[PDB]
Amino acid sequence: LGKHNDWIIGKIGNLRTKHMLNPVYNKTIGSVMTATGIRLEKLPVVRAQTDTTNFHQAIRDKIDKEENLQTPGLHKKLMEVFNALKRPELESSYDAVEWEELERGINRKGAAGFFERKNIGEILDSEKNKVEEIIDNLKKGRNIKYYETAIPKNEKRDVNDFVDEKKPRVIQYPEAKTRLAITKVMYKWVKQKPVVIPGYEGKTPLFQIFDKVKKEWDQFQNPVAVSFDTKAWDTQVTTKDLELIKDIQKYYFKKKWHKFIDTLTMHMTEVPVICEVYIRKGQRGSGQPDTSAGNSMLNVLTMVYAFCEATGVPYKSFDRVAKIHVCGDDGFLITERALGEKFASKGVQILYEAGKPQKITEGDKMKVAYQFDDIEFCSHTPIQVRWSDNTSSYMPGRNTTTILAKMATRLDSTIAYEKAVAFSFLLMYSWNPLIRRICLLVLSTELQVKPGKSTTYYYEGDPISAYKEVIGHNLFDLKRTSFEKLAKLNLSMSVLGAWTRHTSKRLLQDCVNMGVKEGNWLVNADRLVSSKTGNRYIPGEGHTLQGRHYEELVLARKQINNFQ
């Protein structure tokens, strides 16, 4: 242990460590499905929880490892790669944010560390001062007590400050106090404002992401999408790895913060981790503010490097033969055929030498999509929808099973909430006929009650109008979804035995059993329902939003500074 990690000796085994030191259902949604004959039980659990013996058997199974041996002075190439992608106009341009801009959109129940009693909301109120001594301690170079609190998956204090199934079985987060300190200074990195990590799709919302990619796709004489699949990336990050990620910070930030960065970095390269007490041999934890922007950056640098090393393309010229898209570790690049195939064979071998071993699954070769909708990217796969205007767009595609399971369920310790849920989902998965109608059908309940804000999106006004504004077309205009792709994603429902032959037509009755009755009814926004009812839906005015009150548009994200 370093001098800086000698503090855990005085605060003090069973861990058997071999390489590191051990010294409830949505009631309305759920009733909707049930009435249709969907077995809620034979749906997957989708917030599973890990026990003490096997949160411990998982930790020695994954985190207990040595810094994977890496190719010599690789980071001198990975930096050379960063030379070709840097934003020179922003060199020494990032500077800490103010308190006002930081509280803007923050989890006020942020994970509490092993030694804190105040979740993020509570420190923000009184102990704001407690945040700036830690920044002063770090901005000039003063060893503080860096510690990460380790917990198992989906537990209560799995609180973030597709993303919540993109997390490992071992959460590793530092103190709320330190989490705030790092962010109040490195927001403009750890939130990518602006996006300096190319292809970083953290900012891109889901309903846009697949239409976006296909537009690049359609520029190649014969395109192809090689996958990034690395095994447990978090543990495959090394001390040499972090210090490059250190230096990419030191480039953009102003001169006054290189001292803040280095002190934090060296603190992060040997982390005493609290659960039982172990020390960690480098690696990334899953509640560090540098997860998304550290991986994503680290990842493209690796991935651009290895593509360039295998195909022979030099680092600077990448930006014109390929198009990268990461989100943490999961990502994909699009290039011409010959290039793709050469990167999938030679890549495997390179990526292993470079400390990021792939999970080859098809003959020592990386997964390669040859048809555009064969991509899979942060838990979703592209599906095409055909519009009544004879144009075609793409939506964020998943298996109906996971969808129904994520929706009909919610962790807790209300029916306005459920109406927001219904919306959010309908934004994304309107392509799924079973979900569009389930969404609509919750949205048809208690028209008096208005949505809540606890969920991702929500709509003020009239939800069908909220949907035309973001997607760009109307729900009534969705005429035929893609036939082959929808079936593949619906096949699991048959396999798990969660629906009946009737279900795809017991639901459609319910909706028509509503939309034939005289009036102006939500369900008649479904083309099939309306044509089988003759009624229609003349929508009013409605807009989608999130948080306390922002605004989500077609390709923008306007907020509200009326009373800033």
Looking at the fold, whether 336 and 415 belong to one and the same domain comes out as no
3-state helix, strand, coil in the chain (%, to 5): 45, 15, 40
In a domain, 561, yes or no: no
The residues after which the chain has a C–N gap greater than 2.5 Å are 12, 23, 161, 275, 413
Q: Let me know if 513 is exposed, middle or buried by CB neighbors in 10 A (0-12, 13-18, 19+).
A: exposed
* Domain around 448: 382-545
Checking phi first, is residue 519 left (phi over 0); if not, alpha (psi -120 to 50) or beta?
left
Angstrom CA distances, 166 to 60, 203, 410, stand at 20, 16, 18
451 cis-preceded (ω within 30 degrees of 0): no
How far apart, in whole angstroms, are the C-alpha atoms of residue 32 and residue 24?
Answer: 16
In a domain, 128, yes or no: yes
Looking at the fold, whether 502 and 459 belong to one and the same domain comes out as yes
Looking at the fold, whether 209 and 275 belong to one and the same domain comes out as yes
Looking at the fold, whether 523 and 465 belong to one and the same domain comes out as yes
How far apart, in whole angstroms, are the C-alpha atoms of residue 137 and residue 58?
Answer: 35
Looking at the fold, whether 261 and 115 belong to one and the same domain comes out as yes
Q: Which of 450, 327, 474, 451 is nearest to 387 (CA)?
A: 474
**HSE value, Cβ hemisphere, 13 Å, CA-based, for 418:** 23
Q: Which of 67, 64, 57 is nearest to 20 (CA)?
A: 64
How far apart, in whole angstroms, are the C-alpha atoms of residue 528 and residue 512?
Answer: 9
In a domain, 172, yes or no: yes
Looking at the fold, whether 106 and 235 belong to one and the same domain comes out as yes
Q: Which of 423, 349, 406, 537 is nearest to 44 (CA)?
A: 406
Beta bridge partners of 331: 228, 326
Place of tokens 């790669």: 81
Looking at the fold, whether 394 and 312 belong to one and the same domain comes out as no
In a domain, 553, yes or no: no
Q: Where a domain ends, among 338, 353, 368?
A: 353
Q: Are 82 and 301 in contact (CB under 8 A)?
A: yes
Looking at the fold, whether 298 and 402 belong to one and the same domain comes out as no
Q: Which of 229, 240, 185 is nearest to 66 (CA)?
A: 240
Looking at the fold, whether 286 and 395 belong to one and the same domain comes out as no
Angle of helix 415-428 relative to helix 27-35, nearest 10 degrees, comes to: 60
Looking at the fold, whether 90 and 152 belong to one and the same domain comes out as yes
Residue 386's SS3 state is: strand
Q: Which of 120, 122, 126, 116 is nearest to 181 (CA)?
A: 120
In a domain, 122, yes or no: yes
In a domain, 391, yes or no: yes
In a domain, 370, yes or no: no
Looking at the fold, whether 139 and 246 belong to one and the same domain comes out as yes
Q: Are 308 and 315 in contact (CB under 8 A)?
A: yes
In total, how many domains does the chain have? 2
In a domain, 562, yes or no: no
Angle of helix 503-515 relative to helix 433-443, nearest 10 degrees, comes to: 40
Looking at the fold, whether 418 and 505 belong to one and the same domain comes out as yes
Q: Let me know if 255 is exposed, middle or buried by CB neighbors in 10 A (0-12, 13-18, 19+).
A: exposed
Q: Let me know if 442 is exposed, middle or buried by CB neighbors in 10 A (0-12, 13-18, 19+).
A: buried
